[PDB]
């Protein structure tokens with residue numbers, strides 16, 4: 030989805046994933062990335078539909094003495110699958126010694142941006158033929174019937190003539206399509222009229 | 224079964240200057256980069272012509288390792304089709320790299 | 321006349337943009353020839369027919 | 370917890386044309402659509418479990434690439450399932466069950482009892498639960514714990530699949546009259562299972578176990594459930610004009 034179009038779209042479901050990483054590991058929060066975070070902590074699907082937002086959180090997560098409340102995994106017998114979470118505490122063997130698979134970050138307010146804490150929020154968007162629950166701040170206009178108009182219904186845009194429909198829709202159906210995949214009908218989100 | 228000697232390279236006491244960059248042939252070894260995560264935080268890990276996620280499933284006839292030191296803001300120039308002091312007069316990658 | 325070579329001045333107090341970065345470029349050759357560098361994949365048993 | 374000493378009785382039956390579910394969320398009308406994915410193969414060998422006053426048949430089953438699950442009962446004996454890897458306290462597990470009034474999902478590190486079961490509406494699933502990342506109600510569905518006499522009257526079918534950290538649940542309910550002595554057999558015909566729930570569990574699932582309710586005396590009731598495994602196959606689906 031283009032970021033410039035988010036204000037014109039509506040989403041059936043929106044999920045917000047939130048965590049803290051080091052500045053130089055924000056690049057790994059993206060599809061097809063390889064690294065300690067992308068492999069053993071948080072993996073996105075290659076067909077991901079959504080937005081990754083990140084910002085320097087030095088003022089809230091770094092301290093002069095150091096903040097050691099944030100942890101990341103260093104080793105997992107296998108790589109994580111998309112949206113998989115592993116919260117188990119286990120040790121791994123390095124040579125003859127057993128070490129914790131979890132390591133602590135040391136966030137110091139005097140460190141460079143690459144070692145500052147970054148708060149990351151991943152917005153996963155679902156766009157299905159279902160009731161809209163999350164929409165952009167677009168103002169609705171008046172319904173114009175029996176004329177060629179550009180239309181925008183819950184993010185779905187197009188050009189055509191809007192007329193009263195005798196078609197009946199299922200409880201959560203928002204739009205109807207034909208064999209050609211042409212949207213031949215829509216439920217008005219304000220009047221619930223097809 | 225022998226691990227590729229990446230740890231001894233990444234940890235050489237001194238690397239080469241970018242104008243006099245070093246080339247090392249890597250052969251007869253297993254390339255496992257996850258072993259390096261404990262000692263090396265890769266700010267940049269970008270692959271061209273091959274996906275990084277597929278490297279663990281692939282085998283290579285020849286592997287060359289070019290090593291040098293640059294300033295942080297000049298790491299972007301180590302990539303095909305880049306223009307800059309490093310890309311123009313120190314180290315250039317081929318466009319089909 | 322000036323030297324075509326300039327010296328970097330790497331200070332531990334500088335910002336990340338002026339910190340030294342070690343770069344390693346791995347050039348891969350994939351031809352119809354003996355493999356010498358492979359990933360850590362376990363081999364299975366050969367299944368024929 | 371409840372110590373169950375009753376033995377286990379199981380047999381092998383045919384899957385027939387059961388386990389068909391909507392492969393996508395795209396509206397398809399009056400069209401024959403081909404689909405390559407994980408489906409229950411037609412006429413496949415599936416495991417049928419039967420329970421009676423002297424037989425309690427619940428075992429840990431592999432999840433694999435997905436599971437077709439059906440219950441043929443008359444007294445709501447199957448209350449839900451446990452999904453996970455070790456199904457113990459070294460990992461998180463998914464507990465999906467009906468508490469009597471609501472279908473609930475809990476994702477925590479549960480130390481489940483050797484045989485997690487409900488004693489006449491009374492829960493005895495896990496000794497302790499911690500590290501809960503998910504705990505919410507999926508739907509309001511009244512399922513009684515009463516004992517109904519007579520033949521089985523309904524088959525409830527479920528398809529469980531894992532996709533991007535989410536457990537996808539497909540469901541269909543069809544009236545299926547089966548006498549207690551009648552041969553163990555699934556109904557004939559295609560009944561498409563509709564997408565019911567997409568639960569964001571974020572967990573790796575390799576094994577699952579069925580949860581049942583016993584009588585106030587901890588004796589097993591009369592019920593049957595079937596387990597089949599989804600396999601990679603191409604299937605052709607016929608959609609009507611409604612999209613069914």
Ligand SMILES: *[C@@H]1O[C@H](CO)[C@@H](O[C@@H]2O[C@H](CO)[C@@H](O[C@@H]3O[C@H](CO)[C@@H](O)[C@H](O)[C@@H]3O)[C@H](O)[C@H]2NC(C)=O)[C@H](O)[C@H]1NC(C)=O
Nearest residue numbers: 105106107108109110113115362453454455572573574575
């Ligand atoms: C999902 O959970 C399963 C169940 O624990 C995980 O399976 C386990 O994976 C490890 C690593 O792949 C297996 O260990 C390996 O076994 C082979 C064969 O013995 C050995 O050559 C390797 O050196 C290593 O020890 C382990 O056997 C396996 N356990 C079981 C019971 O399947 C699986 O990795 C998890 N998937 C994730 C976290 O993505």
Ligand SMILES: *[C@@H]1O[C@H](CO)[C@@H](O[C@@H]2O[C@H](CO)[C@@H](O)[C@H](O)[C@H]2NC(C)=O)[C@H](O)[C@H]1NC(C)=O
Nearest residue numbers: 160161169170171172216217218219220221222
């Ligand atoms: C959204 O709100 C509008 C009102 O702003 C609802 O429409 C009005 O409903 C009242 C009561 O039925 C009617 O008298 C008005 O004529 C309607 N239109 C206007 C312009 O006021 C509308 O039903 C609401 N939609 C939903 C889905 O709740």
Ligand SMILES: *[C@@H]1O[C@H](CO)[C@@H](O[C@@H]2O[C@H](CO)[C@@H](O)[C@H](O)[C@H]2NC(C)=O)[C@H](O)[C@H]1NC(C)=O
Nearest residue numbers: 378379380381382383384412413414415416417
């Ligand atoms: C379904 O699979 C089971 C095995 O899981 C088959 O059962 C075995 O069949 C052989 C051959 O008849 C018997 O000798 C074994 O004693 C059976 N084992 C068990 C556990 O019953 C069964 O035949 C299969 N059914 C089919 C293929 O229709």
Ligand SMILES: *[C@@H]1O[C@H](CO)[C@@H](O)[C@H](O)[C@H]1NC(C)=O
Nearest residue numbers: 123124230258259261262263
């Ligand atoms: C990483 O692990 C290797 C192998 O055990 C060890 O030689 C090396 O010193 C470790 N590096 C750090 C920074 O712990």
Ligand SMILES: *[C@@H]1O[C@H](CO)[C@@H](O)[C@H](O)[C@H]1NC(C)=O
Nearest residue numbers: 475477497498499501504505
């Ligand atoms: C889930 O929430 C319900 C309602 O608060 C509670 O009774 C139950 O114990 C919780 N389960 C776990 C394992 O946290």
